Amino acid sequence: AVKVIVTDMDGTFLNDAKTYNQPRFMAQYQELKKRGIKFVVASGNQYYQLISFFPELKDEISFVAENGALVYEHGKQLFHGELTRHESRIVIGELLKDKQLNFVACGLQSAYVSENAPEAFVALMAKHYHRLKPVKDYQEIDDVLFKFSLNLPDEQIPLVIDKLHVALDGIMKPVTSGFGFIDLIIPGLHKANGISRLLKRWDLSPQNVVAIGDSGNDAEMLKMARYSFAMGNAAENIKQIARYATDDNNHEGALNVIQAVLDNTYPFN
Ligand SMILES: [Mg+2]
């Protein structure tokens, strides 16, 4: 029985150019709604950036933003994570020890970046955080913080992750959201956790869930879902975790999974 379809955005639902087939998806969505199947967007991007992709459906569908740190259901904020003042001060201090590491502080009202960060970095992060405010001091932000995002040479991700895993003693866990992206999240607050909040809400089970993804921060989501799909362009460990597969993001791979649910083809026959 399928009752929920959850999809990642970057490298998944979106093609390399960050667009999707809107008319095709809109028709699929209307049939899903008709069958009473819920649609969920699960991404590490900011809530405000995520809804920019679904302006005409933003209050109907549900969102697991910031990797599960911010969850909306039918247009209403359901939950948000939070780092204590001390925790965030410690994480920021550790990040700052590396004057070569560029990062953004993700909060409930907005994301923040040093007013001294490189222009290319800010322009790049602006594509993932539509609410991004320059700040003089990361330590003086009046908002609830619940995640940090770094951009760095992709080939350096394993070192940094290992290093950060120890230097923060688990206060926050380093995870990869795709090429050149590293997210620091509150332990346990991943996409799978956010999705479960919705399932609990709807009295549904992981057995009724279809999930589609392509990178490290999708691991728990795919392991939890009965119908797990790895995009054709997915990372190796993700292809291994996922039970099923589909075309890559430049060939409507996510929409094809939705189509299989609607037409009952493998694995939904
Ligand atoms: Mg992705």
From Swiss-Prot:
Keyword Iron-sulfur in record: no
Sites where the protein binds Mg(2+): 8, 10, 214-215
EC code: 3.1.3.23
Positions with a binding annotation for phosphate: 9, 43-44, 191, 217
Pfam families (UniProt xref): Hydrolase_3
Highest taxon of the lineage: Bacteria
Keyword line: Hydrolase, Magnesium, Metal-binding
Disulfides per UniProt: none
CDD domains per record: HAD_YbiV-Like (cd07518)
Gene3D superfamilies: 3.30.1240.10, HAD superfamily/HAD-like
Active site: 8 (nucleophile)
Cofactor binding mode and count: Magnesium. Can also use other divalent metal cations as manganese, cobalt or zinc.
Catalysed transformations (reactions): sugar phosphate + H2O = sugar + phosphate
GO MF entries: fructose-1-phosphatase activity; magnesium ion binding; phosphatase activity; sorbitol-6-phosphatase activity; sugar-phosphatase activity
Function according to Swiss-Prot or TrEMBL: Catalyzes the hydrolysis of sugar phosphate to sugar and inorganic phosphate. Has a wide substrate specificity catalyzing the hydrolysis of ribose-5-phosphate, glucose-6-phosphate, fructose-1-phosphate, acetyl-phosphate, glycerol-1-phosphate, glycerol-2-phosphate, 2-deoxy-glucose-6-phosphate, mannose-6-phosphate and fructose-6-phosphate. Appears to have a low level of phosphotransferase activity using monophosphates as the phosphate donor.
Family membership: Belongs to the HAD-like hydrolase superfamily. Cof family. SupH subfamily.
Subunit structure: Homodimer.
PANTHER family with a match to the protein in the record: 5-AMINO-6-(5-PHOSPHO-D-RIBITYLAMINO)URACIL PHOSPHATASE YBJI-RELATED, PHOSPHOSERINE PHOSPHATASE
Protein name according to UniProt: Sugar phosphatase YbiV
